[model samples]
Target: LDTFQGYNCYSSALGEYAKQKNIDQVENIILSQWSFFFDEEQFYKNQWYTGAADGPVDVVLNEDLRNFANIEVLEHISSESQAIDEGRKVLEKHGLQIVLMDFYYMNSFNWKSLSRFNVTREHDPHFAVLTQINENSVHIIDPYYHHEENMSMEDFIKSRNSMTKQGKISFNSYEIFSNGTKKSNIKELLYYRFNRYLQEKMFGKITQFGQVVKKQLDNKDRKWAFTGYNCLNSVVYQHQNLINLQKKFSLEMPPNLQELLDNWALIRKKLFEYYSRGSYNTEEISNLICKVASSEEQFAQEVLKVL
Candidate 1:
């Protein structure tokens, strides 16, 4: 949620960045930015309370809350529906009405089912998990933010041309095409993510800006490796691209897709190490480039079969 992409004028992050600069100037930019991927994220709605005689705003104020507030809660759910049921109980017990249940990727996406070797459920149902509302925003808890579920309609179209929809990798292409440039990595999309994680986890000396990176660098391999494992999560999105293809086509991904993903999993499992006490063994995690080779081989065969 904190990805600051001010440089990409076509990105939503750019709109967010503009809001920081000037709200009026951002309005046009936000609309145009959203249009680029409107087909993908058409369902997102902001039900922010502005404290202007709104019912929800009145109730919260009566309970002694002020103009703006943010709350983050951790909750457990057995099934998607039960989450709604319990949320209702808590609100009813407190006499508050929900303003919005804001449907997220669950409005039309599933990445987990596609990755695992199973074909159960509709896999195309537009059911969304209910995240109870806070003041204006609610924390999204679904796998939507995960790179795999990050698939948009543009991704499916791009895959037909590129023979791969690995969203993390494919995103580089999206960045290029959307920006009207070449398709390639502009930065270490996954590498820098690892370093940022080390800063957050260890909470290194960040009295200011540059000091955090400097301090974290002085830490150790163990911190870097753990951060690397966390960063390796970007690969999960790449693997999910193959799974998303099956959903888009209403067919199972070629058998080879699973084989490539399985091999990718093995590599990812071996590549990370954590120092629990004295350098404890962690599941390895090989680079995504290695998995890309296997994916390319199978993706080629599958595309040829389809053609």
Candidate 2:
């Protein structure tokens, strides 16, 4: 449990990338990025020291690590409908790249399973590199079990998106939105994400987020364990969005991300109060969360126009 620490195999994944690239003194490079993977607050709050601190942070840090390995980074996939092809296409485009696949997608038809599919444990966000993507078959290198077998692209991708959550890594919180977006694929994976945000994101997921808050608060189950990280995560995500806009479109910080950043401490403090008081509910309690999900609509619209 030293440096590796069983962190959803992110460390091992990094090591794999390093080994392939023949990176010098890979140990030091990996050691320095621990903060990128976790923080003290995660331990004290959620006890989840596995993978990334947040979505944007995960994407951004992954970008950083890919650069360190001398390979290009990809933000592929938008809808679950074509996540497999999207992932396959990325592998097809870039040779022998390390892929952090949707470990949550577990189908057993081609390989064999009880319910046709299942997302068994909580190793969320597993990592492995695609060695080859042939027209009919693909090869992989995995940590849990090194699979050298081949499968049809359809079967493999169906298994890949079995949980249908690739959209999360694709750049939205991830849902099965539209298949057209999946097949179009002309470098608009980023563009589709921008458009997806222009719609009322909060309204779409308002009930879901609100209900999650209700369960945590009213049921007193894992209150603030995962939700607290979410509050901090939005901030990390906004920062990444800001940087992406600035770098790609020369857009400055939008008002929305800034507003959230400014009021963030207060929101977390309010949540802390709720946790300490130990009696609370949604809407009033989760309005701030909605702010996070909705505030970025303007940012996305702006990014869309420029893109």
Candidate 3:
């Protein structure tokens, strides 16, 4: 509950499990398994808290975390009634005591719109650990609120509906082992994530920006700042990240892969320089950016095949 309080609910809940299991190097162990990159339906303008010069924000737990915990998503519950029915069945039949649910609290969208850049802003679909399920009550530990309990099932259902009536609420039950499943190789995991950043996050932003430019040239409501060069910071961050990874792993990038990454970085650097100038043809430059992005994605995919 230190600096880790800033972590999203998913990570915090996983951190709780790590602590309970008496795992040494809790943060290190947990972070090693964390994967990179998925967007929540949040738009580029709505994602100001995602670090501009660092890396994309991690908002949810991925399959790796689920596998590590031996959790199976038995079924996707759509409504409160389904949740109650499935929750009870899992508890009674399988003896799975603790469960995780994705949900949102009241009017989170309105608040998020107002506080896009606020790091302390609590938005997005949250996660909680179900502690108890009784005939008339459901107890939950909301890590987002410092593991507070006492929320009733009725109130919880209402809050979730208010958050996302049809989008974000679901149940995930687990088959916990006293000992966790075999951990993945930390180096390989890091490599896979870096490659994902290159293919998905970095190149994905370039593709998205290109689309925005094409669709919104005359539209006054366009987020031109983002399409122009704001996302170049993510590109720079990924460039530096590759260097950091090489140092951490005590490995050198092979000449072929190194050349590809270096070329991509050079192109991004040139794009940044071009856009930083006063004015330019947005359409022309956006097309070039898309071409560069496609090349980077192709190279990254090839690297992944071998790695």
Candidate 4:
């Protein structure tokens, strides 16, 4: 119940980037839905195809890294020569790249690990984040089997070529990112949208927590009140995610909004403390949530004002 999912390779790839960049909290950074909240309409449009998973990184990468991130479709190969040529470029770059190739072919070389799932994927190839280590080696952050590591280039090409079609071996494309340039509209859209989304979620979560606590106050028999499926443990996990979400959202926020967020953080800390300290008392936690919910609405409005 508390582990990574099969479709979470996007985060794994993301994990690689954040890890390589020396960014702390690789867990939360990879898990952040910041890109998904860049105005839901755009997310809806872009995610139509691969949204079920972490979704395609093609569009979302820009959303996440528009500040100092640089992205390029560096490699488009139709032949082995083209593959070798462009691969060297990415190899030298050593930044992160999202590449897709035949998983069936990948499974062939990785048969040892791939056999575990006993699953077959044909129509869909796998997407992995990798950085070139050398002409003969690369580090792959592939979650398909959680067997990711510095991989042999020999194993790489064998799988890549298995899915070749007609007279051409296409589809070994690279979407590389190091950082990005900023735009004015994006500057306005990002932080406000993230804060607004956070505030809305805070209200929802804190109130829901309150509702359950209040119910338990009226009747102590209901041991799990945060939601029908929640226990103290699950609520603890949810609150942990909430705090991490707030933690990352602050990086995107400007000084004034960051200041606003810091004030709101005090209320969040108070609410978390009351519940976690095992009191679960209606009066203390209840009033804190009122302030939490009230602060959320007030904070959301103030963030929007800046937009």
Best by lDDT: 3
Clashing pairs in 2: 108-112
Clashing pairs in 4: 68-179, 68-180, 69-179, 69-180, 70-179, 70-180
lDDT of 1: 0.28
| Decoy 4 TM-score against native | 0.41
Instruction: Give a tens-digit lDDT track for model 3, residues 159-191.
Output: 545433224444433333435445555566556
TM-score list, all predictions: 0.28, 0.37, 0.45, 0.41
Off by over 4 Å in 4: 1-8, 21-31, 34-55, 67-75, 92-97, 107-118, 121-123, 129-139, 143-146, 149-155, 161-171, 175-243, 247-307
TM-score of 2: 0.37
What C-alpha RMSD separates each model from the true structure? 20.8, 14.4, 9.1, 12.4
* Residue-wise C-alpha lDDT for candidate 1, range 161-230, written one tens digit per residue: 2321111111111100021212212122222222433434211111121122223333444443432332
Better of 2 and 3 by TM-score: 3
CA lDDT of every candidate = 0.28, 0.43, 0.46, 0.43
Candidate 3 vs. truth: CA RMSD?
A: 9.1
The TM-score between candidate 3 and the true structure equals 0.45
lDDT of 4: 0.43
**Top-TM-score candidate index:** 3
After superposition, candidate 1 runs with Cα above 4 Å error: 1-220, 247-254, 273-307
Candidate 3 stretches with Cα past 4 Å from truth are 1-12, 22-124, 131-152, 160-180, 195-202, 217-307
Clashing pairs in 1: 148-237, 267-286, 268-284, 268-285, 269-283, 269-284, 270-284, 270-285, 271-284, 271-285
| True-structure Cα RMSD, model 1 | 20.8
| Model 2 bad stretches (over 4 Å) | 1-190, 198-203, 214-217, 224-235, 244-249, 262-283
